[PDB]
Design a protein around this ligand. Structure first.
Ligand SMILES: [Cu+2]
Ligand SMILES: [Cu+2]
Ligand code: NA
Ligand code: NA
Ligand code: NA
Ligand code: NA
Lengths: 620, 620
């Protein structure tokens, strides 16, 4: 009965029927995005209305549409034709992944380029790469993908080991035209294979690893009700799934004695972008918005017990739509389990004689997605002591190029003649805050150093300062690791027993933000990535930091346009947007398959409770 | 037979006999430090000579001595009388912990101060606090401790809840004189208790936690030989224990096919300091060198199976000396075990059809120590992929004060009238590097942003620069999180298959360093803490960043004096000293016992291997 329940197969089937009957889902139509809309502010009406948002592509060249449907009432709420030269193209379709390779295979310019390199067209894979917005006037309002080529020596070969450098093609996937083929010169195709299951490369497998058995003989400590409502060690939340964002957490709250206290209304990774730093014209256009352009939720993996998730695992299997509106289950797409997390608190006291030890644990909610060469794990953690943490795990195969003779300032060498361009992986977390309710404010906290002198005669004092962010125009903030900068989200109308406003502190990892020149196309399209922290006033339609239609959008949509409203954020319904990322100079150890690297952030209570919240944890 | 084996009870008993027979261990003598010396450079002689270093205190007022003994040959190698006004006092003795309280209990000035506050002397605990060096000329060359008072309402009461503010005393522990009693005014003693095992404070214990069982049905994957030599998943190392430093790792190496490749010769936490930022004269002198002044190894806890260490645990029980030279075992003082660590590498490939997942694990070596109110866990981690990580876990009870009416810029309020002064916890890791041998160098690596223009027409390029540190005078470095700064330790004479020098990259957490004014006493005595990274040329006697005798040393000893030698460090036997710490503004949630907070660093291979080193990990 909960409005935050996962979409069901029957709901998606009803959406299909509603769209079909309204004349919006003919044979030329494809669903590029379908997702359930969150309830409006003030859902205390109990009048359930399950609404879905749909992006509909037309393969005949007609204008796409954005449609909102009510499945409870069986009606189309609104349907708007989109002018894509204005507002952006629709997300890439899974069925377009093969189209780039197939169109190039009959283009004489492409074939001539392959012939000069003595490459058989049947062995050449072409990656379907998002196009961005650059100097090509003919691309405005056309649905373009770019292609880079990789050789597969045989069907099970890793094509990433064999990039075809010096060659790129652009294709119009609606008109089925190859607009440009650019060949800047012949590079040797790197010949070593990268087959990480080949015994000749792995050597004999280790026989030294003995099993680790993790079991819960009484079952797990959490309960799941209504399909996706979790209760665990005073935490309460709902686990949602969206095909664009992936796992979304709703209604994060903590049971503090008698009271259920809200903390976060909605938490998601609302965008992620991979900008490449190689100035070669073959790749200088490369910036993949894995979330906004490709939709990371639709490529979620089915997670295997014992391999992907170890222990006593509870699975969710979310349902999404395929391109024709049929429901499709992602079997075992979300893992949930609790994990031991070492020591929680410990003290042995010299005067009382009391020895005290307690162990910590965390609740894990995770999914794993694959987009081309990249594989990313998204992990949300809830800890006994009130801490909330997000961690991204990046693995997969690095995107490759030739390594130029004479070296490169922008590419790492991985193997003879094989390069990997420098790049970043940058995430945006959207945290619709609800610290003890919706009246929240953000303070920036810096360490303050003090000069030796009167009132500080021994030169040992240090302090802190907090600055309230009062309007959106002053709420675009940068990290400062040297001054220990953090941000506190507090509720000025809710005080702890010491009469101080309750709060949570955001701890960033303080990694570099977007490195591209501020005048670049990517700095305009991924403006969110140029700053560590943004705060906006909540609005229903302000969902993504990059806007609704990221593909081939000319830029400035999303956060820079939102904050121009200069709204009051001092004790209001606010949303925190935190940018964080990995800067990847690939190493030899990343090849032929990359060990996990991680980045993330965490929030810790800051006078939210009246004392430690884990005094009632028993002694194991 | 290994020279790196732990000290045995018989060795310590022999040291006692040698010292006694030489006339160096009369009834007035106390051993303040005893430890085994590492082998000299060039131990390829197989001529074992187990030597011990001893600091001998004299309770009658005679000059202390530093003595080196050979237990293999049964002789005193050297014995030097120490002038403590020059070179520093000896570390605090455990038996002095009670002396401060006992001496004050008969001092009329102390009793008058307690009487005005209506406090019974039998209920007043006095902490034995190291003195530092300030304005008091009479303290030079005298062994001083300072005392702050806390009330215990009953024997099992937590005294930390009841600080007696406005009062401090200084004591000469050799002459048994109270030199000064300072009473700046009456503060109410906070009345709420902090008894975290009292049901009235905890409430009913949770019944919701179900067990997590971690077992290894075939036993662990590591082997222990010779008492303390570990082999695990291609790693090889020796686990040492020193009463000052605690756990020390020796001879860290990795078996890469046919070859045992060294990485780190010796790794330790060589100092740690807790400076307080409260300018009140009652506490403005407070800076505790938990390692150098108190010796963290001698207060290591006995770790309980299931509570402190969970899983299939292998224990070491190191032996130390008591103050009279008797051997004392710290039963179960070191835990060793392996832990599952999630996904190691994962890829599902759209073209080859191969789905690949491997799990990670880490080896954990840990101990836990208690110094007064603080409890610290020291964790060393070795990962399958070559990563080495250190983590400090800080818990215990925060050091308290009164909370002044009208507030404070330097103290947090925890409870009615109860304060906690701001402070830092700063560690120094000493890494005697041996990347593929002893010819090493350090490079500082910064991200380089590039301007849009010719050769970078789309404004997307970015790069990196590496600067070699060639001499000690240029090897004192600061963090720069905004430029992604890291440091690479490489071997210029050992190349990988791409003809690049092999290396390891140090990743810091980029937390603030020492905040005190640079003209302060603590900035002089803890100069190491003012910078993130120091590199020195290896020397036998350059062991600690603060020098050998930290207690009441006037300052400048250790690293600032070492680097004045301006030695060549470009392809030489070098030592990296990394400063890292926590800046603690206490929160209400830290009271009455603090949930663990963490800080640390890690090193990752950087072209050390010819490809990923975990291709031979099997599929679970
Ligand atoms: Cu990467
Ligand atoms: Cu602290
Ligand atoms: Na536009
Ligand atoms: Na909000
Ligand atoms: Na001196
Ligand atoms: Na060295």
């Amino acid at each position: 009965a909960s409005p935050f329940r996962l979409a069901s197969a029957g709901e998606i089937s009803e959406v299909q029927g509603i769209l079909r009957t309204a004349g919006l889902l003919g044979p030329e139509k494809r669903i590029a995005y379908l997702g359930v809309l969150d309830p409006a502010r003030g859902a205390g009406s109990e009048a359930e209305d399950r609404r879905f948002r749909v992006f509909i592509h037309d393969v005949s060249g007609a204008r796409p549409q954005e449609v909102t449907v009510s499945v409870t009432n069986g009606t189309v709420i609104s349907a708007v034709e989109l002018d894509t030269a204005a507002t952006g193209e629709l997300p890439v379709l899974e069925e377009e992944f093969e189209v780039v390779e197939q169109l190039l295979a009959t283009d004489e310019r492409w074939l001539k380029a392959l012939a000069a390199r003595n490459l058989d067209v049947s062995k050449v894979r072409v990656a379907p790469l998002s196009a961005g917005v650059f100097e090509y006037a003919e691309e405005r309002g056309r649905r373009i993908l770019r292609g880079l080529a990789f050789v597969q020596d045989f069907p099970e070969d890793s094509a990433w080991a064999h990039p075809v450098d010096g060659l790129v093609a652009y294709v119009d996937v609606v008109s089925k035209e190859v607009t440009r083929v650019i060949d800047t010169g012949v590079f040797p195709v790197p010949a070593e294979h990268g087959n990480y299951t080949d015994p000749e490369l792995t050597g004999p497998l280790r026989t030294t690893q003995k099993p680790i058995s993790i079991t819960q003989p009484e079952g797990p400590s959490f309960t799941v009700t209504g399909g996706n409502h979790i209760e665990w060690e005073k935490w309460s939340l709902d686990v949602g799934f969206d095909v664009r964002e992936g796992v979304v957490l709703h209604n994060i709250a903590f049971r503090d004695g008698d009271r259920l206290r809200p903390i976060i209304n909605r938490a998601s990774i609302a965008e992620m972008v991979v900008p490449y730093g190689d100035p070669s014209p073959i790749r200088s256009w490369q910036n993949y918005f894995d979330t906004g352009e490709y939709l990371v939720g639709q490529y979620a993996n089915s997670l295997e017990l014992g391999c992907d998730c170890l222990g006593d695992i509870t699975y969710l299997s979310p349902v999404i739509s395929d391109a024709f509106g049929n429901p499709r289950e992602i079997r075992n797409g979300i893992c949930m389990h609790e994990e031991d997390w070492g020591i929680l608190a410990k003290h042995s006291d010299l005067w009382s004689g009391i020895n005290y030890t307690r162990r910590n644990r965390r609740m894990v909610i995770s999914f794993f997605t694959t987009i081309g060469n990249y594989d990313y794990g998204f992990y949300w953690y809830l800890y006994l002591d009130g801490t909330i943490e997000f961690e991204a795990k990046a693995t997969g195969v690095v995107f490759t190029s030739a390594f130029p003779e004479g070296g490169s300032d922008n590419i790492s060498q991985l193997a003879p003649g094989l390069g990997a361009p420098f790049h970043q992986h940058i995430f945006s977390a959207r945290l619709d805050m609800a610290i003890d309710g919706f009246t929240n404010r953000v303070e920036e906290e810096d360490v303050v150093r003090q000069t030796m002198g009167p009132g500080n005669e021994r030169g040992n004092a240090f302090s802190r300062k907090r600055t309230v962010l009062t309007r959106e125009s002053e709420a675009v903030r940068e990290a400062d690791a040297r001054t220990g900068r953090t941000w506190i989200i507090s509720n000025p109308e809710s005080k702890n027993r010491l009469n101080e406003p309750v709060g949570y502190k955001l701890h960033a990892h303080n990694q570099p933000t977007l490195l591209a020149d501020p005048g670049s196309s990517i700095a305009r399209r991924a403006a969110f990535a140029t700053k560590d922290l943004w705060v906006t006033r909540y609005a229903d339609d302000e969902r993504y930091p990059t806007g609704d239609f990221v593909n081939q959008h000319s830029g400035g949509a999303g956060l820079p346009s939102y904050i121009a409203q200069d709204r009051d954020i001092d004790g209001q319904d606010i949303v925190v947007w935190h940018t964080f990322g990995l800067t990847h100079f690939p190493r030899v150890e990343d090849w032929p398959i990359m060990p996990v690297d991680t980045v993330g952030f965490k929030l810790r209570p800051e006078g939210f409770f009246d004392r430690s919240p884990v005094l009632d944890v028993p002694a194991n």
